[PDB]
Chains A and B, each alone.
Chain A
Amino acid sequence: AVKRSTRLGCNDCREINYLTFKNVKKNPEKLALNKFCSRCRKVVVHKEVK
């Protein structure tokens, strides 16, 4: 297999909410989206977590 997935975590409360897929070999940039966070109850910026 290839372990291409990755995990997004909120920055205010630092939980590890979301899971997605990203191909490092092309876009080395760290993803920074903004999605719903269950603890914070609103759309917060999520950034990647190892």
Chain B
Amino acid sequence: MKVKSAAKKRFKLTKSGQIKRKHAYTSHLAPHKTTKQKRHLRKQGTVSASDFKRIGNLI
């Protein structure tokens, strides 16, 4: 069972589950968003427990 290549490059896995991820909406359009939105999205975050099943077996 090969690890999905386009996944292992987006979901670093921490101790005790809790898949880690970066936030979207940070690559393209600066002005359309606000400063509050931009500095809230810089900080990385965990994956919702709904997708945890879809991703754990995807790694």
- Give A contacts to B, CB under 8 Å: 5, 19, 21
Interface of chain A, main secondary structure: strand
Interface of chain B, main secondary structure: loop
Size band of the B side of the interface?
under 10
- Give B contacts to A, CB under 8 Å: 30-31
What residues of A have a CB within 8 angstroms of the CB of B31 in the complex?
Answer: 5, 19, 21
CB of A4, distance to nearest CB on chain B (Å): 8
Residue of B nearest to A3 (CB): B31
What residues of A have a CB within 8 angstroms of the CB of B30 in the complex?
Answer: 5, 19
**Complex: how many Å from CA A19 to CA B35?**
9
Residue of B nearest to A4 (CB): B31
